[PDB]
Amino acid sequence: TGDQRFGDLVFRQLAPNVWQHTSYLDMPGFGAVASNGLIVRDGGRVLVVDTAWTDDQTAQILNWIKQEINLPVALAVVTHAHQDKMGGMDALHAAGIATYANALSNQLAPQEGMVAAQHSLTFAANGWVEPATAPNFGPLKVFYPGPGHTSDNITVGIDGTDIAFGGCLIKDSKAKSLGNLGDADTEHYAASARAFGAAFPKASMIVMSHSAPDSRAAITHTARMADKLRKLX
Ligand SMILES: C[C@@H](O)[C@@H](C(=O)O)[C@@H]1NC(C(=O)O)=C(S[C@@H]2CN[C@H](C(=O)N(C)C)C2)[C@@H]1C
Ligand SMILES: [Zn+2]
Ligand SMILES: [Zn+2]
What we know:
Blueprint: E1 3-6, E2 9-15, E3 18-25, E4 33-41, E5 46-49, H1 55-68, E6 73-78, H2 83-86, H3 89-94, E7 98-102, H4 103-112, E8 119-121, E9 140-143, E10 155-158, E11 163-165, H5 189-199, E12 205-207, H6 217-231
Parallel strand pairs: 5-6, 6-7, 7-8, 11-12
Antiparallel strand pairs: 1-2, 2-3, 3-4, 4-5, 9-10, 10-11
PDB class: hydrolase/antibiotic
Keywords: HYDROLASE-ANTIBIOTIC complex, metallo-beta-lactamase, NDM-1
Assembly: monomeric
């Protein structure tokens, strides 16, 4: 496939300096649910997008980095306050890694059961991160598309590549549903999905939390499912 197993994780190289990490929830009651994030080598440092489901899994990602890249992890950015994205914050913090999330993700974190990130990102009215709140992010281009999967969901493009990361906002072009809608904004979801597409108009590889990377069809298929959901009444 391109995938490689390391312990209980899977890693897939997407570009010379980008890899997808995948971890699987092992809670007795759920199936082995996959969640994806990214690792980005930015020259002499590594940037992480999302934790794994648990601290231990997150620590395994750090060991894979240490072994396969062996550069310091300068920062991590997490894309919303749910377990699959922020479940491993304590592992990041035990490793002395500076962590960033949407201010709103840090405000929601105690209610959701997550450890807040150390630093809060804020956004302009057009959705682009305020650069003063995202210092030395290198190729990570952080975009808040509006409420969708959750109120706080953020997305990230990787400059120098054709990759954009949707997180749980975007589902693959064959998905049957939008997944967990318990925290979703059913009115704005579709528009937020289209905004993500518009913010990264040249990205041709769309990475998402719960499916393999897909084409831009993932974006339009998500926005459709979201508009169907809005119109059910
Ligand atoms: C527990 C959360 O991390 C949860 C969420 O993000 O809302 C997980 N993330 C999502 C999602 O929509 O991004 C879900 S549903 C996901 C999509 N495919 C699986 C599913 O549909 N299930 C029936 C669990 C897993 C997971 C339960
Ligand atoms: Zn979520
Ligand atoms: Zn998810």
